[PDB]
């Protein structure tokens, strides 16, 4: 019956109204032997680089927080790295469920135990080919921008394509500079003729790219866009990949976040019967034993595993479908490293990416 005062911090006016409501739900959801669940509700101010360390250590000081779950309703992942630094000195685990874990930050600092609930870049390029394997789409191109991390994007796709019995063919690598000009962007985009394209650009960098495609002619008829990367001018023909908890309940999302920090450490009590060193010195000890401790996590019919840096090693997730009425439809599922589709199809049929060549297709009887 070791006490554990888990802390909950939220940013945004939306969670202020429901801060008290999440109390009974989170406390009742998690129940482990010999452990006490005492959630505490807190509200943060702003979502930006700010003097969070002024109050985050202040609340940590004098309280046995043990583990705190980070939540934020912001798309920009500019708060995790600054929160990562304060995690290194305190040697305590912080997990982000929504917003905070927008992107995988690797490699991390020495001794960091900060973990995320998200999808790695490589893991987003392995389900994109799995569904593509059973739906032909042999022809594809790669389009990259000036956004950082583009080097890994080209390297990752090349490794998977080579050494395969299918024998994928590549139509070169396309590089575009949004800051150069509209004439340059359109000419390069239309240089290669293909209805299937791969794009990599920042969330705010996408809009200049879509404008070039509108005047390049690669928006109408049937064209495919794979919105893989960080995150009115939205022509149809876009696809992407996200996590399974794309539309999970707010109460259950926090429950999943609080489960790993609390239940994962219950195995330590099986061995024998902590990290409150902020505003204190002369102690560094070790901070790497935590990673191997937090390996066995399984809930809500899902498998959760983390590596040394920390992200979804077994990312049970789903693939979003084509967006037509500004809605995030989902059509593909991936569990136990096995592909599964709800709309099986052969070649190109009605209402599902009809062929781009009406005068170059034949139906042959034999």
């Amino acid at each position: 019956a070791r006490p554990l005062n888990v802390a909950l911090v939220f940013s945004g006016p939306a969670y202020a109204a429901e801060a008290a409501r999440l109390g009974p739900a989170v406390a009742a959801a998690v129940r482990s032997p010999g452990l006490d669940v005492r959630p505490v509700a807190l509200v943060l101010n702003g979502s930006d680089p700010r003097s969070l360390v002024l109050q985050l250590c202040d609340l940590l000081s004098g309280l046995r927080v043990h583990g705190v779950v980070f939540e934020d309703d912001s798309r920009a992942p500019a708060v995790a790295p600054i929160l990562d630094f304060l995690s290194a000195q305190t040697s305590l685990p912080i997990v982000a469920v929504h917003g905070g874990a927008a992107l995988v930050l690797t490699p991390k600092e020495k001794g960091s135990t900060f973990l995320q609930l998200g999808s790695s870049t490589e893991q987003q390029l392995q389900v994109i080919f799995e569904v593509l394997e059973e739906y032909d789409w042999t022809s594809f191109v790669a389009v990259t921008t000036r956004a950082p991390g583009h080097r890994a994007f080209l390297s990752y796709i090349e490794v998977l394509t080579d050494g395969s019995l299918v024998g994928w063919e590549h139509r070169g690598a396309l590089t575009l500079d949004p800051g150069a000009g509209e004439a340059v962007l359109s000419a390069q985009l239309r240089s290669v003729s293909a209805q299937i394209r791969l794009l990599f650009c920042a969330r705010e960098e996408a809009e200049p790219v879509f404008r070039a495609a509108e005047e390049a002619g690669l928006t109408g008829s049937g064209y495919v866009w794979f919105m893989v990367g960080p995150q009115a001018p939205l022509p149809a023909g876009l696809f992407a990949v996200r996590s399974a908890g794309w539309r999970d309940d707010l109460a259950r999302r926090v429950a999943a976040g609080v489960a790993v920090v609390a239940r994962g450490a219950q195995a330590l009590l099986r061995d024998y019967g902590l990290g409150h060193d902020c505003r204190a010195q002369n102690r560094t000890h070790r901070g790497e034993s935590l990673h191997r401790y937090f390996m066995n996590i399984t809930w809500d019919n899902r498998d959760y595993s983390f590596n040394e840096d920390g992200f979804l090693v077994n990312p049970s997730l789903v693939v979003i479908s084509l967006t037509r009425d500004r809605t995030w439809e989902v059509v593909g599922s991936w569990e136990q490293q096995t592909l599964r589709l709800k709309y099986p199809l052969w070649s190109r049929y009605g209402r599902f990416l009809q062929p781009v060549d009406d005068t170059q297709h034949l139906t042959v009887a034999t």
């Binding site: 680089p49 700010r50 003097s51 250590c57 790295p81 600092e109 020495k110 991390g149 800051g179």
Partner: protein
């Protein structure tokens, strides 16, 4: 328009020359509506309240670019980490005066960062050219299990594929270990006799301790080494005739701060020539958004090409690492160090001084040793075998 040039330095006296450098900027140029001011803050010997000082003082003073400095500790990742986080994620460029460690070149973290000194990973760039000219077609790598070591190992291998070479065999250590004698047996049977090290003082301690024990420092052995362990605690049992490397102005804060001021002195004139020139945020709490001019400020920043300062020829480009630096090659004789090699940035320029090889030999050796015995494979075929 008030223009503030922030910086974080060590020691009160060093900050005094910062005022002198910024003072000359106003007079050296014909700027009329631009005024430069210097902000001085000392290093806080703890990371928790380190972020409080930069937020409350430097950020609130709307500085234009920040200069960092080496911490008083001999080797710690303490000073440059917090400074590149708070202001770094406001898209405020940070200038690295003494930043040399190879982690801060990823752009996944530390989105905005500029270095006035080439990092340690770039040492492998001149190793290959010196290796190629002096024959040396067979080598062995001894790199420890560190992220910095991986970058150095990758650079050597990523350029050696032109000549179709796999760099023979590569051994990986565990940092902090004290006895690696047993694993050195795999470094004895190979034909090559050229050993390349890239590690820290602690790692190189055990390597140089057992090197003389296993008769590895005698004739016919040549050691190529990293700059960290040439000077330091590893000098106790360093083998003679070591062909090392060093960088000029490696600990000259006064020279580097002058060059950093000169680069931005012309840059600030270029910024006040375009449209939508939104000022960097005022205060640390009031603004909660990324300010308008992002890569445009950096794009002109990594475009300077002039000839000023002692080092001269600054061409900050790509990830933000200096190109064609001035390197030196030295030798160890009777526990005394003398420099014999001079690098001008394009090719190695030797000297008339004798380059005595390890073990007290003069003739130039090669990384090759014939294998006297041969193991032979055969199969059962009736007429032949």
């Amino acid at each position: 328009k008030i223009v503030n040039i922030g910086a974080v330095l060590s020691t009160r006296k060093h900050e005094q020359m910062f005022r002198e450098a910024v003072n000359q900027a106003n007079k050296r140029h014909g700027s009329w509506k631009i005024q430069l001011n210097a902000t001085s803050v000392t290093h806080k010997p703890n990371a928790i309240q380190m972020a409080l000082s930069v937020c409350e003082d430097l950020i609130s003073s709307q500085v234009y670019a920040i200069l960092v400095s080496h911490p008083p500790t001999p080797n710690d990742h303490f000073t440059p980490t917090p400074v590149s986080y708070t202001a770094g994620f406001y898209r405020i460029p940070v200038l690295g005066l003494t930043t040399r460690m190879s982690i801060y070149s990823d752009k996944s973290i530390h989105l905005s960062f500029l270095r006035t000194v080439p990092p340690y990973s770039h040492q492998s760039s001149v190793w290959f050219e010196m290796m190629r000219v002096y024959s040396w077609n067979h080598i062995i790598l001894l790199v420890s299990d560190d992220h910095e070591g991986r970058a150095a190992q990758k650079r050597l291998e990523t350029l050696l594929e032109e000549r179709e070479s796999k760099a023979e065999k590569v051994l990986q250590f565990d940092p902090g270990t004290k006895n690696v004698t047993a694993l050195l047996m795999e470094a004895k049977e190979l034909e090559a006799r050229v050993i390349i090290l890239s590690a820290s003082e602690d790692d190189a301690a055990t390597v140089y301790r057992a090197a003389a024990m296993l008769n590895m420092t005698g004739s016919g052995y040549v050691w190529l080494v990293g700059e960290r362990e040439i000077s330091g605690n590893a000098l106790r049992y360093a083998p003679d005739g070591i062909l090392g490397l060093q960088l000029i102005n490696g600990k000259n804060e006064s020279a580097h701060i002058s060059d950093a001021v000169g680069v931005v002195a012309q840059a600030v004139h270029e910024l006040l020539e375009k449209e939508n020139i939104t000022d960097p945020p005022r205060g640390c709490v009031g603004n909660t958004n990324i300010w308008k001019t992002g890569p445009l400020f950096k794009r002109v920043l990594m475009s300077s090409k002039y000839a000023d300062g002692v080092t001269g020829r600054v061409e900050f480009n790509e990830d933000g690492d200096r190109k064609f630096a001035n390197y030196s090659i030295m030798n160890l004789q009777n526990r005394k160090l003398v420099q014999v090699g001079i690098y001008n940035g394009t090719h190695v320029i030797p000297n008339d001084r004798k380059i005595i090889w390890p073990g007290g030999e003069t003739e130039k050796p090669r990384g090759y040793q014939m294998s006297t015995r041969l193991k032979i494979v055969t199969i059962h075929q009736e007429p032949f075998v």
